[PDB]
Every structure is written in C-alpha cells, then in structure tokens.
Amino acid sequence: SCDLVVWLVPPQERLQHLAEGATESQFTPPPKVFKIPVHSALLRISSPIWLKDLTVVEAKHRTKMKCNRDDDGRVLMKYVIESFHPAAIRAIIQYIYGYRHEVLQGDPFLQVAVYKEASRLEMKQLQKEVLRALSAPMNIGPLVSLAKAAEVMKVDQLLLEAIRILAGCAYALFSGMRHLELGPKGLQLLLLQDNIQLDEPQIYICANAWLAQQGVPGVQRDMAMAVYRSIRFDSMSPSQIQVCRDPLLDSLLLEACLRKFSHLETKPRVFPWQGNDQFTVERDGGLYPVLLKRTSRSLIWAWTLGDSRLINEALWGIEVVRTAKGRLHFGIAVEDKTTQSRQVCYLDPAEKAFVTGTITNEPTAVSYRTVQPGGDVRWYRRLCDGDIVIVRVSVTTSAIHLSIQVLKSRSMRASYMLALRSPVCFPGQLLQRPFLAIWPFIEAVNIGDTLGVAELQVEAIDIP
Amino acid sequence: SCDLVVWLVPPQERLQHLAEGAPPKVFKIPVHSALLRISSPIWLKDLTVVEAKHRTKMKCNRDDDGRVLMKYVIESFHPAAIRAIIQYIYGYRHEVLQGDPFLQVAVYKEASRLEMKQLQKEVLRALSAPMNIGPLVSLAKAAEVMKVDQLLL
Amino acid sequence: PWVLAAAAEAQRDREAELENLSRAKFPLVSDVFSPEDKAAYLGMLNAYGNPGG
Amino acid sequence: QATLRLHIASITNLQTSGVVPKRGGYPLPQRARGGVSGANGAYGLAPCFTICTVAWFPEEDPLEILGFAQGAGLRVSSAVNTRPSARPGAICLDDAEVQQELNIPISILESPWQQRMLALELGSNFTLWPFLLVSVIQIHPKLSHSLTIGNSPFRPAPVGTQPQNAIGPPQRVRYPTKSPVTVVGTAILPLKQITYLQACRLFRHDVIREMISTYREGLKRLEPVSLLSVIEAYSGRLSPVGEIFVTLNQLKPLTINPVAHAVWIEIRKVVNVPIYGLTFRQICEAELSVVAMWEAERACAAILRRKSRKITAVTRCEVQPLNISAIERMSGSEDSLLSCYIRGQVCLPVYPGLDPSVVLYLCLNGHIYATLASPLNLAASFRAYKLRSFVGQIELRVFPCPANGLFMTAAEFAKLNIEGRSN
Amino acid sequence: LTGGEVRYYSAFSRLQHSQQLENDIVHIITRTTGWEAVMRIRVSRGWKISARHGRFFLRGTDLFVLPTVNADSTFSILMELDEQAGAGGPGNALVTPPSGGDNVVAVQAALLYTNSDGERRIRVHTFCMPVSQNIQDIVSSMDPEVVTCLLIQQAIDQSLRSKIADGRAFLQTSCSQLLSVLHSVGSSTQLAASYALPSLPHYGAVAAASAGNPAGGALLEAGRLVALFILGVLKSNAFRPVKEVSTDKRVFSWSRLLALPVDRICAYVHPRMLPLHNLSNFGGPSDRVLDGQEEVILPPALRLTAEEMTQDGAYLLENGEEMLLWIGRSISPQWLASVFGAHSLDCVHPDVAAASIGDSQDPVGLRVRAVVQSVQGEHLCNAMRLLVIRQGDPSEQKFFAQLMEDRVPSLLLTFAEFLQKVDMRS
C-alpha cells in the first residue's frame, strides 16, 4: 500500500541551456533520476511545505478517479522534487519512516546537506536532531562548508559558531586558496577572533586574494575597506608595512605609526610561541614572535609554555629550519586539573611513545614525568631542515585528541588521545562544542632548533 | 478526520422472529478512522471495503456530492467495548483497567477478533491485580455469559 | 551450497580414524596376538619384567 | 540491439568490514575503521559505509569501469549509504537499499568474435553472454582526524574545477597508489536462466577475481574455456559475503540510433625488433610482452603491469646478429635483430572520450622498446605496422568492438554536454 | 604453601588502574581472618583422600597447616575408594556402625583458628552422603557446577607435571566418559541426536534447577550443562592457546582456579551476559531510588552465544576478573547521553566510562547504575574491573572470547559440534 512515487530528478528541465547551476566538480557530480515509493500517509503530517505542495498534487490527481467508473488497479501520484543537491531528499524519507542512521550519525558533508533541507523546506524540529550530529569530532572539513551553509540561508547564529571554532582552524581556511570559497557577509566576522595563529603578512597576502576574483560600488567602497581595518595592521615591523603602498587604504590604516611609538597597542593575534628564561622572542619588529632562537644565558632539558586560546578544532602550524636528527618535543598542555599544576603531552622522539606529565611553573623544572599507553607512531622518515611538522588537536566532552603530522610522506602520523579533561565547559547555543583553553606547549633539546611560523603552502592539506 | 457516522448496530442472528428477554448502542461519534487502522488490519479490511463502496456511489456522480461522512458497520451486542479500545489508543487507560467486568470481558473478545495479543496479556494481568471478591465473582459471571472458557477457568 | 556448507573444520576424530587405515598401521599387542596367546605373554611379564619393582 | 537492465535493490547482510567476529585477528582494516584516527580511543566500524554497485561482463574489469563513469552504457550505481544490519546475531554485518536500475546495453544478438572463440570453445571441430557479475565496491572513508585528501562521493569545492576526473586528454591518467576503493564482493548472476525478487550470493571478490583471471587468460591465448567450468571447478575457495536481491524479466527491447567498447587486438608475431643494448642471451631470457594502450594513457607504467592490457610470449625468441659480413666482422654491437610468435588477443575497453588510437608498445621485460610506428588511429589481415626505437614490423588484426560500426572521436562525444561531463 | 592471594593487576599505570588496588586492599585487610590455623580433614573408613587442592602446606599425611585462613578459603578434596579399608572387616559394607546398617559416609573438617577477639574456636563442618548400589540415582544426584570444577583441579595437575595439551585432552576424554554413562543409564535413543543448549541458572542455584524437566530429560540437560562448562574452560584464558595468552596470565588463571569457591570458578568458566540497551523495558514501572533493598530485577541471563546480539544493543559481561561492556554499533544516542555524558560512542573515553557511570540522573541512567553495581557487589570484593569496548576498539578480542558457545577463533568449535565430538567417542 505505497500508492506514491517521488520521482527525484535533475533540475530545471533545461539540460542544454544551463551553464551556472552547480558548475563545480565537488558538491554536485551526478544526475539524480530516482524513484522512491513512499506509503502515502506518514508524509504530509510532518511537513508544512510538503503539505502545501501535496494537497494540490492530490487535487489535480483526483481529476480522473473522482469522475471515473473503473480501473481500480494501482495508479501512483507524481509529486516530483526538483533539486541539484545529490543525496539531500533521500535522508528524510528515512527520517519520517522512523529508522534513520544517516541524519543522527551518518557520513559528514551530509550533516551539512540534510540541514539544507531544514532551511529550504521549513524543518524546525529537525534542526535539533541534525545539530547533535554536527556535535562530533569532524575532520575540519564539513565546517568550512558549514560556513558556506549559514551564508546562503542567513540565520546569523550558525554562522557565529561556525567561525569561532574554525578560528582555531586557521592555516586550513587560508592554506590552499580555500578562503577563495568563503563568501562575503560572514567573512567580516573573521579576522576579529583572537584565535587565528598565522603571521600577519600571511593574513595580508590571503586577504588580497578575496578582494580580487569578484570584479576587481557600494560594498566595493564599504567592506572593501572594512577588511583592512579588520586585519590587525598593528604589531608589524615597519619593513613589512612599507610594502602596503597603493592609492588606497591610507586614512583607514590611519597611523602605521603612533600606536607603535606610545607603548599601548591593539589586541595581539593570539600569543603563539613566546619565549621566557632560556628561550626569547625574536621579533619581526612590532610585537609578534616569528622565530625562536635558543638563548642560553651562559644541557638543559626543560620546557616552554604559552597563553590562552579557547578552541574546538585547531591545527596550528609549526615549521623547523635547522635540526640535527630529531631533538624536538611537542604535545599540548591543558588548563583544568583540580589541584591546578598542569598536565602536558610530550612527543618522545626516541622510543616512539606518547608521554604525559605535570608542571609546577619555574620553567627549568620537571615533576614526575611518565609514559602513556596508546602510542600509535612509528619512526620511518628522518626530519631534516625545512620541514612542515604541524600539530592539530581536537576536543571532546571527556577527552582530548592530538596529532603531529609532516606533509612530505605517506608516513609521519603521530596520534594520541589525552585522558579526561575533568570539568565541564559547554558554550552551547544550539550546539555542543566544548571549549577548554588549552595552552600550546613546545620543547626543544640542544642549542639551536629555531622552529618558527609555517609558510602558507601552495596546494592543500585537509578539505578538498 | 471529520468523519465516522459509524452506524454500529447490535445484530440479531438467532433472533429472527423473537428476541430473548434481556441498550442498543447505535453510535454517532465525531472522531477519525485512524484508530481502526492502528488497531488491526482486520478492521482495516472492512474499512477499505466500506470506504470504497461509498466512493463507488460517487464515482459516476459529479453533482450530487453532498458530504456523507465515511461510515462503518459492525454486528456486536457491545460496541462500547470498541469504544473502550478507542479511548485506550488515545492515552488514558483508566476505563480499560478499572470498570465493569461485564465490559472488560467484551474487550477481551474484541481482542480475540483483533488477533492483538498485547492487550490480551494485560487484561489477564488486570484480573491478577489486588481487587475484592465482589467483582471477582462479577467477572466470573461475565466470562460465563459470553462463554469464555479460559478467563473463567 | 555444497561447496559453501561441506567445507567444515569439524572432522578431528572423523579424519583421525582414516589414517588408522593408511600410513599409521600401529600393530599393538591385541592386534598381533590371539586372546589366548595374549594371556600367555601377560602372565610371562609376571616374573620377568621389572624384577625390582 | 538488446537493452537489458537489473534493478539492484536490497544488498543486505553484507560483511564489508571483512572481520567476521570469528576471524579473531581484529585489526579492523583501515577501510572500515571510522573515527578520530588514533589508538584504542577512537577506532571502530564507521557508523555507515559508502556502497557502489557496478555490473560488469566476464570480459572487462570492475574497479576500472568506474574510471570511465566517474561522473555518471549505464553500469555504475550511485553512492548508496549503508546501515548496521540489526536482527539477532551478526556483529559485523551490514544492510543497504541501492534501489537503482542498471541499463547495460548488451548489444549484438549475433557476432563473429564469438563464432571463432565459440568453436575453439567446443574444440573448433539471450545466449552467447551467459553471465553478468554485479560486484559491490566500497568508497574508502578516511578517519575524521587524518590530514590527507578527501574521497567522499559528496564533497565541498575549490572554485576552478568542473565535475570531472583525471583522464581528460591534457591530464595524464594517474593510478592511485593507495586504493581509493576496494571491492567487497561480486555476484555471479545466471543470465541465461534469469512477486519477482530473485536473490544472489555475494561471493568474496578474491576467489571470483582469481576465477575471472583464468577465464581471461584463456581467451588471451585463443583457448576460451566456459565460465561454468571454473564456476564449478574453482568453487572451493568460494566464500559467501552477503545477498543482493535482483529483479529479472526486463524484456530486452531494441536500442536506438552505433558505438565502440573493445578492440580485441590480436597480435600474431613480431619480425625484427632492433633490440640494442642487451646480451643476446639476456634478450631471449626476457619476456617479450606486447602491451596495448588507448593513446591518451601515453606510457603510464601502471597499465604496463595490468594483466589485461599486457600479453607476453610463450614461444621461443630468435635473436640474429646484425647486417652480417659487417657487424659480424666488427663483433660486439649489443644491437641485435629479434622476433617471436607472441600469439594472443588483448581487449582494450574504449574509454568514452579518448580519440581511438591504440599504440601497442613492446617491452622485453620493463622497458617499452618499440611503439606501433604512428598511432593506429582507428575510427575509420596484418597492417605491416612498422615499429620504432623506444626505451621493424608486426602482424595484428583489430576485431571490431561490439560487432561493427563503432569508434567515437574525442570531439564527437565531447560535443554532447552529458551530465556536464563535457562542460 | 601459606595461603595467600596472587592478585596480578598487569601493567599497573594508575589512570587505567589504582581504584582496584584501593578497594581490594580494603577487602584483604579488613575481612574475616583466622590466625595460627590448624586445618585437618578426615573421612569415614572404606574411602581415602587422594587429591588435595587449595592453598595450604602438607605436614605429615593429613595436616593442612595454614598460617591464616581467609574469607575466601576453598579446599578441594577428591575421594577415591580405599581398598584395604572397604574390605577386611566385620562391617565390610560401606560404613557399617554396630547399631545396624547406617550406610552413610561422612567427611569431617576441623579448623583450629584464632579469631579477631583473641580466643580459639574450632570451626567444624559436617557433610554426609548415603550409600547406593544403583546407577540411576548415583548419576541423578550429581551437580554439574561442581563436577566440572573437580575436573579442572585434576586438569591443572595434568598440565603442571605434564604439558598443557595433556590437560586439554583430559577434559575432552573425561567429558566423553561422563556422557557414555549418561546414555547408558538412559534408554531412549534420541537424546544423542539432541544438540540444544541447556538451562543456564545462576551460580549456587544449580542444584535441582531442572524442576519441571522430566526424569531422563533432566538427567540429560544437566549433562548438557556439564558439556557447556567443559567446553568453556577449553576456550577461556585458562586453557587457551598461546597466540593471545602470555605465560604469566596463564599462571594467574591456574593459581586462581585452585582456591576459588564454586561460585567464582563457575563465573570464570561461563559468564553472564546481560542485555542493557532497553533496560527501561526490562525493569518495572516502579522506578524507586535503587539502594539495595529495592529489587533490581536484573534482565534474564542470556545464553553466551553469538546467536542473539542485535547490532544496536549494548551488553555487559561478567566473569569475576575482567567485566566487559561491549556497547556496539548503532546504539540509540538518547540512551548514550543518558548513561555516558557525550553525544556519540566516539567521544566515550574507555576509562572514564568505567569510573563515572550514569551522571545525568536519568531514570534510564539509574537503571544502568543498579545493573553494574549489583553485578559488582554480590560479594564484598565489589570492584572487578569494568572496561567499555565499542564495536571496533581492538580490545574486543576479550569480549568475543568470553563467548562459550560460538566458535571462538582460538578453538574453532560450536557447542553443537563439540557435542558431536564427545557423543561419538562415548
């Protein structure tokens, strides 16, 4: 007793004329001529706009049988859905059937696509169950397509939380010209977070790419200006603000000076990689550390530590410039333990293991260092000079994830999962993403090991 | 929806000429027919037959389309047992659990026509509830009158 | 069907009985001797075998 | 010509994982493991999987037919996501509702190609095609924490690329080193013998593949053995893996307006390969192997190792000196004239969108030594094809693809839009 | 030789550990302990005491010198017939006192122990068994829990002086000799064709739990309970091949089996799997605060097979050492957040799920509280190492190998085909 077939179809009914609709290799490959039978009832109760477009379907389908005499048979209704979104519709027949698996815990990039039917087809109760599936340790990935999500549907709330959890995901929004995707409106709230860990010239050169590629008035004189006041043009060396010169900007940079002279500045970017005691900060002029010498006052096997960054997902970029066969240590510290006193992670490049600890300030110190079970890492490729050795973490209601990756081999993955965080901190406004303010934790061994800030690549890391 | 004239009437069978000595509940209730679908496909078989017989009367009829709500006919002495099943589906189970054991046995026989073994089990649990010897012999009357051997045993 | 189901590791002794007809001859005492001759040797072990035990 | 179609719709009780609880060793393959890539913490079956269903004949290969239809005759099904089969028992099983029909244009209702091999089948003293394999391929899901490229069917976009693949003329065919897709089970559907709902015993690819292998090499050395044989010959290894419920009774009608999908290149013998640097002995100690290639490919190592587009020899390889009364008088000169009787039929599936131009190469062992002098550009016996110098005559005929009237030009096809496949 | 425990918490690394070491030292120190104890066992004439097992010292020929008896002392005594005492006497019938027949043997245990309050008591235990010549009743009064455990104690003797495989072949042979007897005392020649899994009652309740099973059917199904335990030891960590079993856990498994009560032996060799996904449907509507006197009504003990686990369930397992909670594959997240505060099983950390249980105070969650803590605390040793395993975490080699019915990969044999082996050589 089905008595209905949906007849999903490739859209617009004009498959010679179209040249703009989903002309892109990634989010719409296929044609979608599908035939799903649904069982008439349990279809029109749930939805407002399905019922708005189905009472007229049966009204024009009764133009035969209500004035007929015979042909009992089995004749179907013909409520066609018009769409270029490939799967989309298919996951919501399985919702209203009562047995889902694809909305609540399905494959990602459909946790973005099912929620498009929530906006375009007026599902209000469904957004609650979709948003719990968004609450997941995703592979960065769907979030940049989820920043595209709230740009088109204009909710202003999902855009607000997409970007403060992607603010830690800098060096991936920028990376291989991926902000070339990220549209207007919501980009103005970017470059205002205190969580982007990149170097300001690298933020500058990527910002010029978005100011191109559209047509380069109205917004062209309002926001194509407001981007430059959004970027933190303070904290610079003057030797890099001198290549900013053009018949634009000027009155809106305002100073490029003055705030530099009198020693109160704007908000620093985040903090990343400061040195104290045996490490120092080697400035590129203004305020931001960009390279970190070994600076012994007069070996010492001690550590350094950093400041705060409230993050869901982050993949901050570390590169090394000079190294003699190893002699480095990575792994994060986190804020919350009951008797304060820290707890870190310690990338041990001797016995391929992952190591936790605890810290009582006074940087030349170690208290009761211990190894950990779960150390999935092997050694194969030696890291030489000029390597990209970036570190990415995740967060969980009762766990922390962490990895070290080198971008020149099929090898060089270094994954561990830290233990329970201990407290609760859920900044959830329609979402669940916990924030913890982990402090990045860096260590080096012998004289040298400059490290620094990673260059912003050419091709890709994690999205496509 | 806004339907169910439901002319449910008590039958006669053996009472062609004279009826045995010792109300006739000819129903008129303004509820929907989804309760009969949820109950069992046994009532859904006669539901489809009746609604298509009324539909056939308006198949060849374009002008005389006055709203006659979709009807139903059953032949039972106690259609109030079907009413008890109806309000059981709505949500409060009070009249099913506690009430006249004369009606409770009639719900048990209508569940035999339902082939719906769920409620058959908790009316066997409802007679196992702590309950006085007064209505115990009243349900002993009621199982005897309708010739229900297992509930009487 | 037949290939699917008859491929079973459940032999053990239903394989083990088969080599005790081929390349596992094992002529033991009861096989070599008649029952009346077996009582003759087993009564001869009374005085001759293991004289200290 | 015949137009058959199967309504693949049910694939239930699958074993995708491949780690049936009673398989002990539980390194849940890095293709079923789906979570925050790492240690004990996150590593388990991935909620749902991505299933693809191809319908191939015993002649071509499955995990390559997709290569032609990366976008979307009709053979590759669409990304159908699976679910964790419930039911009591079954701890690593899987269900999935493909509900997609496959319009396979099994053209030709009478052909000479068969006639010949068909005679060689009985000993040379709808029917014909008696089997249709429907293998299920699984898209490899990367764990949500690794930092590598994506492979998910539905994907976000980097502006500046149309929904296409790495085979476009300018681009050079790449062969993913790390497999982006594995086959998780084939299914031998008995075509001849075809409330319908017929079932099918999804049989692990490993065996089915080994089986398909024999049949393949048989045809090559002009010795076709009937599938039925191995099907009941190999059997043994046959390991069940699931059940694909199919719909028969499609009633093959007629096709409209023809095209190509083969070339069964049949090499007869080489003549005077001017093999240069190589010890005369070492030369005849190689494996003279002619390897077909649909131009575009253009010397793509991988292909030269595929045991389908490669045919080595089994006869002897004569290695004469050179010139005589000259190089013989001069001695040395590793250069030698060599021939051989490489007998066999290859079969290069015509990629939809590659200007037909077989460039049969020949590599003693691992070194394309000679290219069919000038692309055998087909489109419109032995053609005395000359050979060239790579690192001088060959006998070979090109049996037609379906039966006759075929070969589409790159431009020809291109000019048809088609799922935007061609802008 | 002095009567102590050999607790073997392996790879002791605090975060995954150290709660059991707090709890078990509290049990060990503050329990019922005797001191300067003198155990002696004696048996009626016509019967001797051949194999003596437990944690004691053998002084002389009958004196079990035990420096401290503990709350979990268990000594196993095997009786074999005394030839020189049964024959050559006035009362040559089995135990014939001068009053009359009185053919009832007796075993007497004495424990000269110092208790905590500085004074001496002799704990006297008396067991007696009447004497019968008939073969039906001698095989009907057997106990399938105890007769298998006795075969384990003689099996560790087999594998201590000889190789491990000599113990393994002893279980298979002793199973077949028991089944030949059960078929010989039976008369209907269709009980050999039956390969059904028997009744599986609780530990200690297996004396006469057959009840309505009639006569020879009850006699057979008790032997099918024997066949399930004796197959179970062959699959358990105690007699498993060396591929996933190290030597040192094998020593702990042997040493534990020689001193446990029949309750704790029977948990190891045959677990109890408990269904936990729809605990709301298992329990009654009266969800009062569950604090001991409120009856937990645990879900019924599922047979330890592969034939009933739905893929979207969540099941517990207890064996007395390592209790494992394999959740599974597509369990409903509305149950998941109620029990473990999270959104997915991917975010469930293995160690904090065992430590912190049910923090949301859901009535669904409190059902999971009473299920785990009752299984923890039938006895006072409470904490016995919960771990959670999702479907795919590589530790599931444990969970699918405490299944004593489906073919464990260490020993590829079902329960039905194991019966096919042992009823053929019977």
H helix runs in E53-143, sequence order? 83-86, 135-140
Touching pair B, C by Cβ (3+ pairs < 8 Å): no
Cβ neighbours around E153 below 10 Å, total: 18
Burial B106-130 (b: 16+ CB within 10 A, else e): bbbbbbeebeeeebbeebeebbeee
Listed by the residue before each break, gaps in chain A with C–N over 2.5 Å are: 216, 298
Provide the experimental method for this PDB entry. Answer: cryo-EM
Q: How would you class D256 by CB atoms within 10 Å of its CB: exposed for 0-12, middle for 13-18, buried for 19 or more?
A: exposed
Answer whether D236 touches C (CB < 8 Å): yes
Asked if A370 and A357 touch (Cβ cutoff 8 Å), the reply is yes
Residue C1 distance to chain D (closest CA, Å): 10
DSSP symbol at D21:
G
Q: Which of D202, D234, D239, D241 is nearest to D218 (CA)?
A: D234
Q: How far apart are CA E139 and CA E116, in angstroms?
A: 43
Strands E386-389 and E323-326 turn out to be parallel
- Give the C-alpha separation, E284 to A11, whole Å: 54
Q: Is D296 on the interface with E (CB under 8 A)?
A: no
> What number of other Cβ atoms are within 10 A of residue E143's Cβ?
16
Q: Rounded to whole angstroms, what are the CA distances from D103 to A9, D74, D107, D164, D418?
A: 17, 5, 11, 22, 16
Q: How far apart are CA D21 and CA E398, in angstroms?
A: 11
Q: Would you state the structure tokens that stand for residue D165, as one six-digit string?
A: 């693949």
- Whether the CB-CB separation of A11 and A84 falls below 8 Å is answered with yes
Distance CA E311, CA E330 (A): 7
> Nearest CA to A43 among A58, A54, A29?
A54
Tell me if E109 sits within 8 A of E124, measured CB to CB.
Answer: yes
Whole-number Å distance between alpha carbons of A79 and B117? 39
Q: Which chains does E contact via 3+ CB–CB distances below 8 A?
A: A, C, D
Closest to B93 (Cα-Cα) out of B52, B56, B129, B123: B123
Q: Which residue is listed with tokens 């082996």? A: E421
Which strands make up the sheet holding A345-348, listed edge to edge?
A345-348, A353-358, A367-371
Residue D382 CB partners (closer than 8 Å, separation 6+): D268, D394, D395, D396, D397
- Can you tell me whether residue E411 is helix, strand or coil? strand
Q: Is beta strand A77-78 parallel, antiparallel or unpaired with respect to A4-5?
A: parallel
- Assigned token pair, E368: 């999971």
Cβ distance of E425 and C13 shorter than 8 Å = yes
> Do residues D201 and D240 lie in contact, with contact meaning Cβ atoms separated by under 8 Å?
yes
Q: Which of E420, E422, E426 to mutate to test the interface with C (most CBs of C within 10 A)?
A: E420
Tokens standing for D365? 């062992």
CA distances from residue A462 to A173, A195, A199, B69, D43 in whole angstroms, order as listed: 10, 19, 20, 62, 19
Q: Is E346 exposed, middle or buried (0-12, 13-18, 19+ CB in 10 A)?
A: buried
Can chain B be said to touch chain A, i.e. do they have 3 or more Cβ pairs within 8 angstroms?
Answer: yes
**C-alpha to C-alpha distance for E77 and D310, rounded to whole angstroms:** 75
Q: Which helix (H) or strand (E) holds E360?
A: none
Nearest to E97 by CA among E172, E148, E46: E46
Query: How would you class B53 by CB atoms within 10 Å of its CB: exposed for 0-12, middle for 13-18, buried for 19 or more?
Result: exposed
Q: Could you tell me the resolution of this structure in angstroms?
A: 3.5
Query: How many contacts does D have with E, using Cβ atoms within 8 A?
Result: 77
CA distance D379 to A299: 75
- Exposed/middle/buried for B67, CB within 10 Å: 0-12, 13-18, 19+? exposed
Helix then strand count (H, E) for chain E reads 14, 11
CA–CA distance, D72 with D352 (Å, rounded to integer): 12
- For residue C10, list chain E residues with Cβ-Cβ distance below 8 A: 413, 417, 420
Q: What is the number of other CB atoms lying within 10 angstroms of the CB of residue A132?
A: 20
Helix/strand/coil for B33: coil
Closest CA to E406 of D243, D84, D24: D24
Length of chain E: 426
CB A57 within 8 A of CB A78: yes
Residue E173 CA to residue E180 CA, distance in Å, equals 11
Please name the residues in contact with E278: beta carbons below 8 A apart, sequence gap of 6 or more: none
Q: Looking at beta carbons, which residues of chain D come within 8 Å of A314?
A: none
Task: Work out the minimum CA distance from B112 to partner chain A, whole angstroms.
Answer: 25
CB–CB of A158/A233 below 8 Å?
no
Q: Which residues contact B132 (CB under 8 A, 6 or more apart)?
A: none
Angle between the E144-161 and E262-269 helix axes, to the nearest 10 degrees?
80
Residues of chain A with C-beta less than 8 angstroms from the C-beta of B62: 67
**H helix intervals, D76-175:** 112-122
∠ CA D99-D101-D103 to the nearest 5 degrees? Answer: 170
The token pair that represents D6 in the structure block: 């199967």
- Residue closest to A202 by CA, chosen among A331, A310, A319, A329: A319
Subunit contact D240:C4, Cβ cutoff 8 A: yes
Half-sphere exposure for B37 (CA within 13 Å, toward CB): 9
Is the CB of residue A377 less than 8 Å from the CB of residue A414? yes
Q: What is the identity of the amino acid at B24?
A: P
Q: How many CB atoms lie within 10 A of CB E344?
A: 24
Asked if C13 and E420 count as a contact pair (C-beta separation under 8 A), the reply is no
What string of H, E and C letters represents the secondary structure of chain A?
CCCEECCEECCCCCCCCCCCCCCCCCCCCCCCCECCEECCCCCCCCCHHHHHCCHHHHHHHHHHHCCCCCCCCCCCEECCCECCCCCCCHHHHHHHHCCCCCCCCCCCCCCCCHHHHHHHCCCCCHHHHHHHHHCCCCCCHHHHHHHHHHHHHCCCCHHHHHHHHCCCCCCCCCCCCCCCCCCCCCCCCCCCCCCCCCCHHHHHHHHHHHHCCCCCCCHHHHHHHHHHHHCCCCCCCHHHHCCCCCCCCCCCCCCCCCCCCCCCCCCCCCCCCCCCCCECCEECCCCCEEECCECCCCCCCCCEECCCCCCCCECCCCEECCCCCCCEECCCECCCCCCCCCCCEEEECCCCEEEEEECCCCCCCCEEEEECCCCEECCCCCCCCCEECCEEEEEECCEEEEEEECCCCCCCEEEEEECCCCCCCCCCCCCCCCCCCCECEEEECCCCCCCCCCCCCCCCCCCC
CA dist list (Å): A41 to A37, D233, E195: 12, 52, 48
Residue with tokens 């962490």: A402
Residues of B in contact with A69 (CB under 8 A): 59-60
**Which residues pair with residue D290 across a beta bridge?**
D311, D362
CB count within 10 Å of CB E391 equals: 22
| Token pair in block for residue D289 | 């192997």
The Cα-based distances of E423 to E32, E216, E225 in angstroms read: 45, 16, 14
Residue E149: HSE in the Cβ half-sphere, 13 Å Cα cutoff: 26
Token pair recorded at residue D363: 């590599």
CA D299 to each of CA D199, D291, D309, E235, E279: distance values in angstroms, whole numbers, following the listed order: 43, 10, 12, 56, 64
- φ, ψ of residue B104 to 5 degrees: the values are -65, -40
E interface toward D at CB cutoff 8 Å?
A: 244, 306-312, 328-330, 345-346, 349-350, 390-397, 400, 406-410, 412
Which candidate from D44, D89, D93 shows the least CB-CB separation from E392?
A: D44
DSSP structure class, residue D301: G
Instruction: Quickly count helices (H) and strands (E) in chain D.
Output: 7, 18
Tell whether the torsion through CA atoms of A235, A239, A240 and A246 is positive or negative: positive
Residue A2 CB neighbour total at 10 angstroms? 11
Neighbors of chain A by Cβ distance (3+ pairs < 8 Å): B, D, E
Query: E122-127: long-range contacts (C-beta < 8 A, 24 or more apart)?
Result: none
CB E390 within 8 A of CB E345: yes
Gap between the Cα atoms of B24 and D347, Å rounded: 84
- C3 and D236: CB-CB below 8 Å? yes
Beta strand D50-56 with D12-14 is unpaired
Q: Measured between CB atoms, which of D47, D100, D148 is closest to A106?
A: D47
Q: Smallest Cα–Cα separation from A417: which of A402, A431, A427?
A: A402
Contact (CB, 8 A) for D9 and D245: yes
